[PDB]
Ligand binder design. Structure first.
Ligand code: FMN
Ligand code: FMN
Lengths: 261, 261
């Protein structure tokens, strides 16, 4: 904590800055001593990361970054932590000059120098990590269509059970599957298991109806199973036709009863 | 590029150093002017991250970290880049003082100052990201045992098809499934589809044989399907008994033919 051990020399200082400039990282220095704790230290890389000019950023708080996606709970945690003068690390959504939305990790830690406080903001981009997750998702997608098991039960009997919570993102795969069903028109009976699926959405019912109509024209009976009794009662009120389509408490039970003669 | 704009003051310098110390990040400064470009600038956090003392690091090249897991190709790329005085980013496995292996991302970028060259080494830990992938893998594991579908074909007939490339890690789930199969001893016929699997390993054939023996005692016929004709010819040479087990070209074909009276 001296000019001896610290090691002055302005040449050393220039080196440290260039290194920071080479890699885009958001580190800034604020001064509580000045009004509203304004930001004094800013690197060039900051501008490229936020897309904001250095002149605008200096003299103003990173408040302008906050927008609709900004999580008030995180904001509140930060406010608490400064009052507690204790370090805090949180992730908070932020907006650029062009409105681009990106995630920005913020780490704040108090300093005690010359009996004076200090604040530092560190911003670490989560984008590289997001790209990694996206790569994984793409792999899952190719994998998901492939898993899409096919296994005819018998001759003219086919089944396509669904397991998991059907999200809107996942729904695209299903609509595409409609084209495949036309190819499988040969199978007279199709059995769909909804038992895997925890719950069934109302929008889903509309999909079931469209399929039965297309299937009826093509001459393919549709069977629905894994329907909860409570759900069926609700369905009856909506339309007497719902009861028209054979319903089995479970897949094993439908399969066992199916054959009889 | 001057003491004016740079902004001297040793107090500012101590501020920058503590902030680096608070968060463990491997940044070091080397001097090509001296012999063998020795490292002069090192932070305390470096020691905790590498588990090496500052006195031993300073004066020596990061070459000691390299070990068995070190990738020569990555080393050669670095050597090429320095000669080409162009920045290079690579990921290279390293070793600690206790022999703990970890991944170390290295970024090198040349600097031109006062008509002198300078080299900087940046190390970023991929441990956090590793933990994240591990969390994902745990989910997949719970999900994988759960996905393990169960769908009896009929009364007495059950099938458990395999899809995907059977790794050694994956093999643990299968051995565990052996216990479940005992519970399923009720089903007289068990059909296993190897068609989904791209290839079959010779070690696998040992597993099939053990299963048929246990199954035969319990009184449970075992049917293998999806076996490639080329593979069957190879199997015939190893043991006639291989033919002994019924083999179908496909699952659909075996299912259709199955019933006949
Ligand atoms: C050092 C420091 C850096 C900050 N950096 C960011 C930031 O990059 N992004 C963000 O959303 N909030 C950041 N904040 C929070 C805001 O700058 C500000 O402290 C908060 O919005 C409360 O200020 P206000 O009263 O003007 O809203 C930072 C806070 C401090 C103290
Ligand atoms: C600035 C700088 C930092 C380096 N840091 C590391 C490091 O942390 N880990 C690593 O495996 N290699 C690192 N290297 C590579 C070695 O330090 C060294 O350059 C390389 O092994 C060739 O040196 P040698 O001829 O002694 O093998 C670094 C190289 C430079 C130039």
């Amino acid at each position: 904590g001296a000019s001896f051990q610290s090691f002055g020399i302005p040449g050393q200082l220039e080196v440290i800055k260039k290194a920071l400039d080479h890699v885009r990282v958001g580190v800034v220095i604020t001064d509580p001593a000045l009004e509203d704790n304004p930001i004094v230290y800013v690197n060039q890389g900051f501008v490229q990361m936020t897309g904001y000019e250095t002149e605008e950023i200096l003299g103003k708080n990173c408040r302008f970054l906050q927008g609709k996606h900004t999580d008030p709970a995180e904001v509140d945690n930060i406010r608490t932590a400064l009052q507690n003068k204790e370090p805090v690390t949180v992730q908070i959504q932020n907006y650029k000059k062009d409105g681009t939305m990106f995630w920005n990790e913020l780490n704040i830690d108090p300093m005690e120098i010359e009996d004076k406080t200090y604040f530092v903001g560190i911003q670490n981009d989560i984008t590289k990590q997001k790209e990694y997750e996206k790569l994984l998702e793409d792999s899952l997608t190719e994998i998901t269509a492939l898993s899409t098991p096919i296994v005819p039960i018998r001759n003219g009997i086919s089944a396509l059970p669904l397991v998991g919570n059907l999200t809107e993102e996942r729904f695209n795969s299903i609509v595409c599957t409609l084209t495949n069903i036309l190819s499988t028109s040969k199978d007279d009976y199709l059995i769909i298991d909804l038992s895997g699926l925890a719950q069934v959405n109302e929008q889903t019912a509309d999909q079931i109806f469209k399929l039965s109509h297309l299937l009826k024209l093509t001459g393919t009976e549709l069977i629905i199973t894994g329907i909860k009794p409570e759900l069926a009662m609700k369905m009856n009120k909506l339309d007497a036709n719902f009861s028209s389509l054979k319903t089995y408490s479970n897949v094993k039970d439908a399969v066992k009863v199916l054959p009889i003669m």
